[PDB]
């Protein structure tokens, strides 16, 4: 896997997430527990992940192969499904992003 060519295949699936409005809005920056006043967040969520961090990882070439990228995307989703209640807007928005992601990523993984 050449990093620039891998980035060209993976990045459209990240943009597809960012395009989701409002559903990507809680995911575009790292969760800020001090601003949101949720001091238990880093207790429950051991490994934070968000779209901005995944973008930087993609841009800088830290994904050697596509399943590490998939793994971080799902970590983002999984953190929010763990921390947030099923009835909450963030949780529902998370499920929406995951639905978009599976639609986007499956053709890309098969082409890779
Ligand atoms: C500047 O952009 C705004 C900042 C406030 C944000 N916000 C909000 C605000 C505050 C409360 C009321 C509300 O409805 N919010 C909100 C706002 C926009 C959304 F798209 C959304 F789904 C929820 N709640 C957030 C929750 C989380 C979160 C994630 C992801 N994982 O664990 C937690 C906790 C992250 C952000 C939240 C939503 C986007
Ligand atoms: Ni593009
Ligand atoms: Ni939408
Ligand atoms: Ni390499
Ligand atoms: Ni993982
Ligand atoms: Ni598409
Ligand atoms: Ni699938």
Author numbering: 1049 to 1160
Give the original sentences from the paper that presented this experimental model:
Many proteins, including the EP300/CBP histone acetyltransferases (HATs), contain several targetable domains. EP300/CBP are critical gene-regulatory targets in cancer, with existing high potency inhibitors of either the catalytic HAT domain or protein-binding bromodomain (BRD).
As expected, CCS1477 binds through canonical hydrogen-bonding interactions of its dimethyl isoxazole moiety with a conserved asparagine residue in the acetyl-lysine (Kac) binding site (CBPN1168, EP300N1132, BRD4N140). In EP300/CBP, an analogous tryptophan residue is not present, and instead the equivalent LPF shelf is less bulky and facilitates interaction with CCS1477. CCS1477 produced a greater thermal shift with EP300 or CBP, as compared with BRD4. Further analysis of the binding energies by isothermal titration calorimetry (ITC) confirmed significantly stronger interaction of CCS1477 with the bromodomains of CBP and EP300 (Kd = 4.0 and 26 nM, respectively) than with BD1 of BRD4 (Kd = 403 nM). Lysates were treated with biotinylated-CCS1477 at 1 or 10 μM, prior to western blotting.
